[PDB]
Design an enzyme around this catalytic site. Structure first.
Site, PDB file in Angstrom:
ATOM      1  N   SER A 122       9.675  -6.090  -4.620  1.00 52.46           N
ATOM      2  CA  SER A 122       9.240  -6.108  -5.569  1.00 52.46           C
ATOM      3  C   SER A 122       9.605  -5.108  -6.880  1.00 52.46           C
ATOM      4  O   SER A 122       9.197  -5.040  -8.461  1.00 52.46           O
ATOM      5  CB  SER A 122       8.236  -5.575  -5.665  1.00 52.46           C
ATOM      6  OG  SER A 122       6.589  -6.128  -4.698  1.00 52.46           O
ATOM      7  N   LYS A 161      11.068  -7.280  -9.467  1.00 55.52           N
ATOM      8  CA  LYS A 161      10.310  -7.479 -10.782  1.00 55.52           C
ATOM      9  C   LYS A 161      10.335  -7.012 -12.317  1.00 55.52           C
ATOM     10  O   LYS A 161      10.967  -7.721 -13.192  1.00 55.52           O
ATOM     11  CB  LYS A 161       8.390  -7.283 -10.501  1.00 55.52           C
ATOM     12  CG  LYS A 161       7.946  -8.232  -9.962  1.00 55.52           C
ATOM     13  CD  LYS A 161       6.622  -7.855  -9.854  1.00 55.52           C
ATOM     14  CE  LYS A 161       5.373  -8.187  -8.688  1.00 55.52           C
ATOM     15  NZ  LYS A 161       5.078  -7.475  -7.615  1.00 55.52           N
ATOM     16  N   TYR A 197      -1.687  -6.517 -10.219  1.00 55.92           N
ATOM     17  CA  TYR A 197      -0.562  -6.415  -9.907  1.00 55.92           C
ATOM     18  C   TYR A 197      -0.300  -8.131  -9.482  1.00 55.92           C
ATOM     19  O   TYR A 197      -1.489  -8.626  -8.731  1.00 55.92           O
ATOM     20  CB  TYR A 197      -0.122  -4.982  -9.006  1.00 55.92           C
ATOM     21  CG  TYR A 197       1.513  -5.119  -9.141  1.00 55.92           C
ATOM     22  CD1 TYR A 197       1.565  -6.328  -8.139  1.00 55.92           C
ATOM     23  CD2 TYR A 197       2.239  -4.719  -8.916  1.00 55.92           C
ATOM     24  CE1 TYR A 197       2.731  -5.651  -7.468  1.00 55.92           C
ATOM     25  CE2 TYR A 197       3.475  -4.154  -8.979  1.00 55.92           C
ATOM     26  CZ  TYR A 197       3.509  -5.403  -8.000  1.00 55.92           C
ATOM     27  OH  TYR A 197       4.952  -4.760  -7.761  1.00 55.92           O
ATOM     28  N   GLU A 202       6.126   1.471 -14.368  1.00 59.81           N
ATOM     29  CA  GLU A 202       5.129   2.414 -14.299  1.00 59.81           C
ATOM     30  C   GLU A 202       5.411   3.213 -14.842  1.00 59.81           C
ATOM     31  O   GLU A 202       6.775   4.218 -13.702  1.00 59.81           O
ATOM     32  CB  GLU A 202       4.354   1.946 -13.112  1.00 59.81           C
ATOM     33  CG  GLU A 202       4.367   0.883 -12.988  1.00 59.81           C
ATOM     34  CD  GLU A 202       4.124  -0.241 -11.541  1.00 59.81           C
ATOM     35  OE1 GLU A 202       3.383   0.839 -10.486  1.00 59.81           O
ATOM     36  OE2 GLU A 202       4.118  -0.396 -11.434  1.00 59.81           O
ATOM     37  N   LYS A 240       9.508   1.992  -9.377  1.00 64.80           N
ATOM     38  CA  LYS A 240       8.998   0.858  -9.255  1.00 64.80           C
ATOM     39  C   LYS A 240       9.127   1.111  -7.789  1.00 64.80           C
ATOM     40  O   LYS A 240      10.795   1.502  -7.856  1.00 64.80           O
ATOM     41  CB  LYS A 240       9.979  -0.095  -9.359  1.00 64.80           C
ATOM     42  CG  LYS A 240       9.105  -1.171  -9.673  1.00 64.80           C
ATOM     43  CD  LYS A 240       7.895  -1.482  -9.720  1.00 64.80           C
ATOM     44  CE  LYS A 240       7.472  -2.964  -9.489  1.00 64.80           C
ATOM     45  NZ  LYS A 240       6.473  -2.751  -8.201  1.00 64.80           N
ATOM     46  N   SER A 285       8.838  -3.749  -0.866  1.00 65.04           N
ATOM     47  CA  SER A 285       9.580  -4.443  -0.323  1.00 65.04           C
ATOM     48  C   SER A 285       9.141  -5.560   0.504  1.00 65.04           C
ATOM     49  O   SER A 285       8.978  -6.487  -0.434  1.00 65.04           O
ATOM     50  CB  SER A 285       7.882  -3.497   0.418  1.00 65.04           C
ATOM     51  OG  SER A 285       6.752  -3.895   0.661  1.00 65.04           O
TER      52      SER A 285
HETATM   53  C1  LIG Z   1       0.722  -3.092  -0.833  1.00 69.80           C
HETATM   54  C2  LIG Z   1       2.103  -4.056  -1.124  1.00 69.80           C
HETATM   55  C3  LIG Z   1       2.565  -3.919  -3.005  1.00 69.80           C
HETATM   56  S1  LIG Z   1       2.870  -4.680  -3.447  1.00 69.80           S
HETATM   57  C4  LIG Z   1       4.518  -5.614  -2.123  1.00 69.80           C
HETATM   58  C5  LIG Z   1       6.162  -6.823  -2.978  1.00 69.80           C
HETATM   59  C6  LIG Z   1       6.692  -6.063  -3.285  1.00 69.80           C
HETATM   60  O1  LIG Z   1       7.673  -4.933  -3.169  1.00 69.80           O
HETATM   61  N1  LIG Z   1       5.886  -7.363  -1.985  1.00 69.80           N
HETATM   62  C7  LIG Z   1       6.904  -8.125  -2.036  1.00 69.80           C
HETATM   63  O2  LIG Z   1       7.753  -8.317  -2.999  1.00 69.80           O
HETATM   64  C8  LIG Z   1       7.270  -9.448  -1.247  1.00 69.80           C
HETATM   65  C9  LIG Z   1       6.320 -10.361  -1.082  1.00 69.80           C
HETATM   66  C10 LIG Z   1       5.993 -10.605   0.564  1.00 69.80           C
HETATM   67  C11 LIG Z   1       4.494 -11.902   0.962  1.00 69.80           C
HETATM   68  C12 LIG Z   1       4.859 -12.114  -0.618  1.00 69.80           C
HETATM   69  S2  LIG Z   1       6.714 -11.307  -1.283  1.00 69.80           S
HETATM   70  O3  LIG Z   1       4.626  -7.894  -3.934  1.00 69.80           O
HETATM   71  C13 LIG Z   1       3.712  -8.091  -3.313  1.00 69.80           C
HETATM   72  N2  LIG Z   1       4.024  -5.755  -0.926  1.00 69.80           N
HETATM   73  C14 LIG Z   1       2.659  -5.365  -0.583  1.00 69.80           C
HETATM   74  C15 LIG Z   1       2.121  -6.195   0.508  1.00 69.80           C
HETATM   75  O4  LIG Z   1       1.321  -5.418   1.476  1.00 69.80           O
HETATM   76  O5  LIG Z   1       2.536  -6.571   0.754  1.00 69.80           O
END
Ligand SMILES: C=C1CS[C@H]([C@@](C=O)(NC(=O)Cc2cccs2)OC)N=C1C(=O)O
Length: 354
Positions: A62, A65, A147, A268, A309, A312
């Protein structure tokens, strides 16, 4: 002598963190007083074993983004994109849908109401457009913060089209080269595959992220800690690199208040000096809806703030924080996804020591 003191601080927090969370490899990059410090720990891959080096690429999830936001800001300062216009103004196939009442700003600030994850069955643009034409938010756009990877995807798609290029070309041929980030990629090339760390999932299996539709915008970046520290320095105006500097800075404009945070264009921010309790609360907002209150006129980019930011993937965990007033910042990259509260607490302890 400040270098040895910073290394002691970082070593003493990172080694126990890696031990107790079974994190194979990390890189931590710190900038202060115009100087850069990079610390590498452990293994990029277990078998065959490979150490983390200055060249190791990590998935940042993320954090990607913020690159979509930087691209949208570049389009805005170039006169190609107006953030208050509707999404359907830029995406004609959505005219007549709910996106007549969703602004580009809404998708850039997680206030459209689109859900967190792309529906798993959506594989191509035809399926994506059918979903978006049928979608309706539960609340009016602009009233709540949810989000969203889908909103981020639209932000990047719209920005790229307004600049006349694909998102992949926008990032890899213009944005990253102009920022001097030559070891940052959406698609890692063959000569860098030896440097691409493996991620280790919850079952300790080695994994790399699977790129799906609009994925580059939301979670596609692989990079070194050195390149991300350059990105942090550029966001604090410390590098020569004029439109690009304007674009970076303008992403820090504050558009909505929600809970403890101010929502910028994907970034943020929190008040500085920062409360660790409020920083933890502000970094626990990814999966629930919250009320959003507009800041109008928007808050100009500030110096006296903590901008951050998280990111993961199934195999990686990352965090960036910086305080422009103090010209200090931190990048923490790991090839295991460990809890956000620990990332933020370690970062707070390191920057507070300076
Ligand atoms: C708790 C959060 C914060 S937000 C973060 C996040 C950005 O880091 N994961 C990704 O970017 C990688 C992806 C995995 C599946 C689609 S995307 O946004 C979904 N994921 C999670 C999660 O528990 O899944």
């Amino acid at each position: 002598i400040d270098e040895s003191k910073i290394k002691d601080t970082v070593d003493d927090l990172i080694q126990p963190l890696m031990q107790k969370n079974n994190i194979p490899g990390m890189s931590v990059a710190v900038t202060v007083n115009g100087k850069n410090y990079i610390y590498n720990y452990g293994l990029a891959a277990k078998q065959p074993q490979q150490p983390v080096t200055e060249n190791t690429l990590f998935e940042v999830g993320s954090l990607s983004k913020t690159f979509a936001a930087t691209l949208a800001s570049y389009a805005q300062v170039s006169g190609k994109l107006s953030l208050d216009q509707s999404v359907s103004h830029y995406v004609p196939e959505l005219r007549g849908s709910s996106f007549d009442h969703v602004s580009v700003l809404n998708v850039g600030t997680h206030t459209s109401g689109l859900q967190l994850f792309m529906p798993e069955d959506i594989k191509n643009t035809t399926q994506l457009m059918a979903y978006l034409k049928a979608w309706k938010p539960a609340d009016a756009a602009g009233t709540h913060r949810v989000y969203s990877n889908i909103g981020t995807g639209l932000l990047g798609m719209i920005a790229a089209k307004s600049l006349g290029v694909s998102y992949e070309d926008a990032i890899e041929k213009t944005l990253l080269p102009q920022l001097g980030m030559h070891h940052s990629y959406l698609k890692v090339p063959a000569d860098q595959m030896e440097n691409y760390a493996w991620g280790y999932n919850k079952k300790d299996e080695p994994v790399h992220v699977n790129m799906e539709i609009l994925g580059n915008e939301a979670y596609g970046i692989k990079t070194t800690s050195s390149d991300l520290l350059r990105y942090v320095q550029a966001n604090m105006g410390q590098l020569k690199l004029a439109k690009m500097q304007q674009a970076l800075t303008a992403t820090h404009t504050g558009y909505f208040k929600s809970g403890e945070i101010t929502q910028d264009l994907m970034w943020e921010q929190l008040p500085y000096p920062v409360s660790l309790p409020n920083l933890l609360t502000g970094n626990d907002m990814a999966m629930t809806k919250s009320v959003a209150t507009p800041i109008v006129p928007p808050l100009p980019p500030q110096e006296n703030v903590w901008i951050n930011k998280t990111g993961s993937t199934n195999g990686f965990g990352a965090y960036i924080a910086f305080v422009p007033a103090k010209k200090m910042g931190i990048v923490m990259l790991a090839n295991k996804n460990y809890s956000i509260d620990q990332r933020v607490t370690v970062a707070y302890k390191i920057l507070s020591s300076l």
